[PDB]
Amino acid sequence: IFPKQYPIINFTTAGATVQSYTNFIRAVRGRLTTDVRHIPVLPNRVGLPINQRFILVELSNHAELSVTLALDVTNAYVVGYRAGNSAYFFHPDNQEDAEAITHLFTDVQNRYTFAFGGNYDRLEQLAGNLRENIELGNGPLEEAISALYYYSTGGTQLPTLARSFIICIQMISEAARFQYIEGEMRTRIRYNRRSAPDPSVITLENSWGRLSTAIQESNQGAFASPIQLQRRNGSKFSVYDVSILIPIIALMVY
Numbered sequence: 001i002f003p004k005q006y007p008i009i010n011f012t013t014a015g016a017t018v019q020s021y022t023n024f025i026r027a028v029r030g031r032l033t034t035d036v037r038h039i040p041v042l043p044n045r046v047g048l049p050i051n052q053r054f055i056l057v058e059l060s061n062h063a064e065l066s067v068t069l070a071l072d073v074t075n076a077y078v079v080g081y082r083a084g085n086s087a088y089f090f091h092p093d094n095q096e097d098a099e100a101i102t103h104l105f106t107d108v109q110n111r112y113t114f115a116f117g118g119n120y121d122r123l124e125q126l127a128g129n130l131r132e133n134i135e136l137g138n139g140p141l142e143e144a145i146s147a148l149y150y151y152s153t154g155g156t157q158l159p160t161l162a163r164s165f166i167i168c169i170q171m172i173s174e175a176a177r178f179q180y181i182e183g184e185m186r187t188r189i190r191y192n193r194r195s196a197p198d199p200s201v202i203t204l205e206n207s208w209g210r211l212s213t214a215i216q217e218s219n220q221g222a223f224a225s226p227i228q229l230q231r232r233n234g235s236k237f238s239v240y241d242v243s244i245l246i247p248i249i250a251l252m253v254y
């Protein structure tokens, strides 16, 4: 088939720098937001044409293996990926999204849909580790790309695959959603170190939907009820209005 053509952003771990990773994340944001409350809001899923529903992230590593992740522009989340002659999809939430993803990678000979969604709860269970024990950085991403690639010929076990999804979703989707998490990956690249995310990152990730709702329903930025977030040391604090989150959250779900 001659599939529908979605925008494609490239990143390689070979020779990766703070700047090249920053350019990558900035490019992903720019193609995701094609509407600003106080912070850009991702396009409404309602009435969004199929030709504008997806973007593609092509990842390459030092071994010159390439995989292509497919991102939903309405929530910045990975719905599936292509490696060579195979395409793999998380289980869709509803019939409409199931139809939308039939338009991705349609020239691939083998299409596979998992029974599990791309959510952290199930991915962590499959990986056998929580996010707080899965290291992130250029090293983990290099390994994630290879693990994703070799799943198509059975060279990757499912826990490794699920761990590699958790790495990719955070270093791409969450970093695009939050300048704070983009900064977290920047720092790992600066020290050439790999480390798991701390509670401030993990709780920010868990709070994206609630933070988005609180901001968009706020009275001139003021929240109706406070949102609890975590500090780096695990202690909690309350967020009462959108202003403190401006340097933190870069994209909001509609």
Ligand SMILES: CCc1cccc(CC)c1-c1ccc(C(=O)O)s1
Pocket (backbone or CB within 6 Å): 180, 200, 201, 204, 229, 230, 231, 232, 233, 244, 245, 248
């Ligand atoms: C400006 C600080 C801030 C604003 C909005 C949300 C959060 C939570 C991710 C944070 C913090 C980041 C680390 C903090 C700490 O370790 O004290 S607070």
